[PDB]
Chain A
Amino acid sequence: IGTYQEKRTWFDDADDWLRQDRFVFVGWSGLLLLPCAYFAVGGWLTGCTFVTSWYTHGLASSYIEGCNFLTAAVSTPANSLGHSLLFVWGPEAQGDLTRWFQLGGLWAFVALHGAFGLIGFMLRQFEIARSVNLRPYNAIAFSAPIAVFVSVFLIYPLGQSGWFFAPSFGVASIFRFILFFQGFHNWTLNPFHMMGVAGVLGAALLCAIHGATVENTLFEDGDGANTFRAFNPTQAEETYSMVTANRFWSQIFGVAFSNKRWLHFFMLFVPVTGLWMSALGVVGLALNLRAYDFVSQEIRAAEDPEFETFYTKNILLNEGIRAWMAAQDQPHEKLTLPEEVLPRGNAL
C-alpha cells in the first residue's frame, strides 16, 4: 500500500465491488448493516402485525388481534425467563418457531439485530466519510443515539430482574415505560434527565434559531420573490450576512455568535451532550440508584404535618402510580391487592 501495492488480492476485488458508488452504498459495513437492520425492521413489523403478547404480558399487541398502530407493540418476554437470550434454538423455545413467537423471543431477536444494525450504521458513516475524505463528526454525533439505545434497551433491563422491564417496541408500550419510570424511579427529579431535557430543548432551539436567522439574513442574489432560486451549489460567497446576524442577535439577546465553525460545532455539541448525560442517568436507574427523594424535606414533613411543597405532591403521585399500576403491569408478582390498601384521595 505505502511502499508498494504488491499484487491485487481477492480482498481487493471485494473492496472495489463493495465501494462502488451505486444508488444504495453497501460498503464493507453494509454486510453487517443491511441484513441486521432489515431483519430488525421486518421483525418489528411482523410482530406488530401477527405476533401477540397474551402469554408474555397477558396483553393483545398485534393488528390481527384488533390493535392499531398506536397500541400494537413487540412486547418483551416474560419475567420468568430472566435475561435469557431466547435463541430460537435455545433451551426455552427448543426450535418451535410458533412457540418462540409466543414466548416473546421476537423481542430479543429485534433488539439484538437492531443493536448490531446501529453498530453497522456507525461503521457505514465512518466508511463513507473516509471515502470522501471528511472528518467523521457525524459518526461521533451518532454515538449519542447508540449510547441511549444501549443504556435503555440493554443496560437497564440487565440491571433489573429480566428483559420484562425493557421498553417494548411500540408506541403505547414506550408510553407505559415512561410512566413506569416516573412512578417508580422518579425520573423527572433525576438531574441527568434534567441535563438531557436541557440538551434536547436547546438543540431544538438552536435548529429553529439557526434556520430562521439564515433565512432572514440572506443576501439578495436574485430578482425573484422566491429566494430559493437565488442560490448556486458551487458558489463561494456566503448566502447570508454573518455580520448582520451577529449585530441583530447582539442587540436583541445580548450575545451572538461570530464564528461559523463554533456555531455549527455548538449545534452538534448540545444534543450529543444532553443524550449522553441522560444515558448516564439511565445507567444509574438500571442500578436503582434513583434520585428519588430529598431526605431533609421528607424528615421535615414527617416532623411537621403542615409543611408541603410540590416535591411532596410529586411523591404522592408516584406512590399512586406504583400502587395502581403494579397489579397489572407486573403479572408475575401476582399482586391481588384489595381496593382498601390502594392509596386514594377524597371522593375520587
Chain B
Amino acid sequence: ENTSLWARFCEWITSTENRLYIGWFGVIMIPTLLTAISVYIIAFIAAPPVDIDGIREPVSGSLLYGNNIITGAVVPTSNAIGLHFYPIWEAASLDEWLYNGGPYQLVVCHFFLGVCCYMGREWELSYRLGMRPWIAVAYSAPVAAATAVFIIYPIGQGSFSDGMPLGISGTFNFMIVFQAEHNILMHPFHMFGVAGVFGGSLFSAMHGSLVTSSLIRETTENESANAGYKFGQEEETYNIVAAHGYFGRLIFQYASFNNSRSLHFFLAVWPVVCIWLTALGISTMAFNLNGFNFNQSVVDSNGRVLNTWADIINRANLGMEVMHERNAHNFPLDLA
C-alpha cells in the first residue's frame, strides 16, 4: 500500500486486527481514561484531606488516611473554587492542589471526555464491522446519567462541591442530600427510572428464563447443557414457538412479541428510555425543579391540616436538611 508513514499509522489505528479496537475516538479515549485511572488510583490510595465545603474543615477520603474501601472516596472540589477551572498549574503547589480537591476535577474532566469517546468508539467499531450503529444510542443513557451526576448537577448548583463524590459512602451522602433538597423520590422521573431498573430486572429474568427453558435438547445429562451450543452453530438452538406459547398462556393470549426482533427492541428500549428519563430528572432538579410537593395538601372542614404519607416524607426530609452540612450555612435558606 502507500509507503507514507501517515497512511500506515491510519491503517494501524483503524485496524480491526487489534486485540482491543483503537479508533479515532480511541486516540482520545485512551489518554484521557488512562489519566483519570492513574489520578483516581493514586488519590484513592494516598491523598490528603480535602476541604470540600470550603469551611476549612478537610474531609479524609484516602486509604492511607484511615479509610476502608466503603468509606474511601475522592472528595469533590472545594466549595470555594465553585465552578472555576482548577488545573494543577493553577495551584501554587501540589499541596494546595490536593487540599482544595483538584484531583476530583481532573478525574471528572478526563473521565467525561473518556466516556464520550467510548461511545464514539462503540459507533466506530460498529461501522468498521458492518453492523447497525445503535449500540452507542443505548450506551448514551449511562453517559447521560454520569454527566448529570458529575457535570450537570454541579453546574446547576454552581459548584463542583455538589458533584457526586467518587466513592461509595460519598455516593450515599450525595443521594441523601439530594433527597433532602429536592424530594427526588416524589419526582416522576426517578419514578420512571425505578420502573426502568425494575423492568430491566424483570424482563432480563423473564427473557433469560424463557430462552433457557426453550433450549432444545442437544446435550444429554452427565454434563452441562452449554456444550450443546457451538459458537458457529449459526442456528437457533431454542424452540421460540414453545416459549411464545408459554408466555402467552401465562398471562393472556395474543401477548405479542412473537417476533424475536420486536422482543429484543423492547428489551433495548425499556431500560434505556427510563434511564434517559431519570437522568433528565436529575438535570432538571439540578436546575431546582424538584418533585411533587403535596405537603399539607389535605385540610379538614375548619382548616386543620390532615397529615399524609407525604407529610412523613417531609419530616424525614427536614431531618436530612438540618444536618447535611452542619457548619456551611450562615443563613436560613439554602438556595445553593
Contacts and interface: CB of A to CB of B under 8 A. Distances in A.
Contact of A233 (B234, B241, B312, B319): B241
Contacts of B177: 317
Contacts of A144: 205
A217 to B, nearest CB: 5
Given A320-B319, A324-B319, A66 B229 contact: no
B114 to A, nearest CB: 14
A180 B316 CA distance: 8
A207 B270 contact: yes
A343 interface: yes
Interface stretch (B105-113, B121-129, B282-290): B121-129
B129 A137 contact: no
A260 B229 contact: yes
Contact of A207 (B214, B241, B271): B271
Interface stretch (B79-87, B92-100, B148-156, B242-250): B242-250
B211 A345 contact: no
Interface stretch (A18-26, A106-114, A155-163): A18-26
A120 to B, nearest CB: 13
Interface stretch (B2-10, B38-46, B324-332): B324-332
Interface stretch (A5-13, A97-105, A125-133): A125-133
Given A210-B264, A262-B226, A294-B68, A274 B201 contact: yes
Interface residues of A, number: 131
A313 interface: yes
Contacts of B16: 251
Given A61-B309, A325-B315, A134 B242 contact: yes
B312 A176 contact: yes
A18 B306 CA distance: 49
Given A65-B306, A68-B294, A328-B312, A189 B169 contact: yes
B129 to A, nearest CB: 6
A265 B207 CA distance: 9
Interface string B268-310: 1111100100000000000000001010011100000011111
Contacts of A170: 309
Interface stretch (A38-46, A77-85, A87-95, A242-250): A242-250
Given A73-B309, A274-B201, A211 B138 contact: yes
A27 B137 CA distance: 43
Contacts of B146: none
A218 interface: yes
Contact of A261 (B137, B228, B246, B249): B228
Interface string B220-260: 00000110110111111110111111100110110000111
B70 interface: yes
B266 interface: yes
A288 interface: no
Interface in A50-71: 54, 58-61, 65-68, 70-71
A135 interface: yes
Contacts of A119: none
B265 interface: yes
B28 interface: no
A238 B242 CA distance: 16
B47 interface: no
Contacts of B172: 188-189, 310, 314
Nearest to A313: B173
A204 B201 contact: yes
A309 interface: yes
Contact of A66 (B175, B233, B236, B297): B297
B271 A345 contact: no
Contacts of B66: 297, 300, 307
A238 B236 contact: yes
Nearest to A241: B131
A237 B204 contact: no
A216 B132 contact: yes
Given A208-B271, A217-B131, A243-B231, A310 B205 contact: no
Interface of B: 16, 18-21, 49, 57-61, 66-68, 70-73, 121-122, 125-126, 129-135, 137-139, 141, 165, 167, 169-170, 172-173, 175-177, 179-180, 185-186, 196-198, 200-215, 225-226, 228-229, 231-238, 240-246, 249-250, 252-253, 258-262, 264-272, 275, 292, 294, 297-299, 306-313, 315-316, 318-332, 334
- Which 8 residue pairs spanning A and B have beta carbons closest together? A211-B268, A204-B200, A268-B208, A324-B319, A211-B267, A267-B208, A320-B323, A172-B309
20 contacts: A59-B308, A59-B311, A70-B292, A180-B316, A182-B176, A200-B197, A208-B272, A211-B267, A214-B264, A217-B132, A228-B265, A239-B260, A248-B129, A251-B125, A294-B68, A306-B58, A314-B169, A320-B320, A324-B319, A345-B322
